[PDB]
A paper describes a structure:
(1) The serine protease inhibitor Kazal type 1 (SPINK1) inhibits trypsin activity in zymogen granules of pancreatic acinar cells. TRY1 adopts the typical serine protease fold containing two β-barrels sandwiching the active site cleft of the protease. The inhibitor assumes a typical Kazal domain structure with a reactive loop surrounding a central α-helix. SPINK1 binds on top of the TRY1 p.S200A active site in a substrate-like manner, creating an interface of almost 1000 Å2.
Numbering used by the authors:
A (entry chain A): 24 to 247
B (entry chain C): 20 to 79
Write the structure that this text describes.
Amino acid sequence: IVGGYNCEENSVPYQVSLNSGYHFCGGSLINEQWVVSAGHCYKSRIQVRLGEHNIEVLEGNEQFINAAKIIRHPQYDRKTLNNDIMLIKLSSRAVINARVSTISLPTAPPATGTKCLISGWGNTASSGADYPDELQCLDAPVLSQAKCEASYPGKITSNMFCVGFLEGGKDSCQGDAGGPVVCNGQLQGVVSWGDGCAQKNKPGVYTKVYNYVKWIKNTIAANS
Amino acid sequence: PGYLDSLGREAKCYSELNGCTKIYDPVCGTDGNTYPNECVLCFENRKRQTSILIQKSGPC
């Protein structure tokens, strides 16, 4: 997260990390036993960690839970990053408390101007390498379909949308993929891609979770 | 392991969008720099017209 701030303790209880040897993506707890992340975050083995604030110094509410089942969207497209979404079934039920709890799916597609909260342990520098210990938060609005298509001509599918600033300086960055975009208590987006991080007229592009609400519940149901 | 045996490989990127995935999946360039993922090394070689190869996956 470039140009964000340290999340308040208990402000993003739904934030998880995906781990393989290191911190490689984020995710969102959407059920006591299920995480939603990006398709490009797929690996054949993933350890999910829940309740982290500082990713290097244990604070004591962390839960470490290996993935039982790792399901990349079946129409995931590596060329276009269309259907950049993934479900992880935790091998055990998360224990729910103040530091660990679920976030609602969206009941309607994203609205232009809506305030969203973006979070993650990805790069804080648009130039070089500044990976933080402390979980990072960004307030950023949903941008019009027109500004999004102008910024990424012919590359924005109906399963993507833009959140951030055309002025640059504030964005998700490498290490944030799979992380949440929460607007009005609903997971409207997953961190997916962009043209660098925090560049002028190159806001982040996010998977539009609303379009996957039916596939998410159906896939959870079939694997419960 | 002499020069020819130790040569780097070309960054190969599948995504066609003038941008990169925001995963952290580091690679080590023949320049000794860690690139946050292969797409970002491809993008960087294209932008600056450089030929930084991958010595190996992971950080340097």
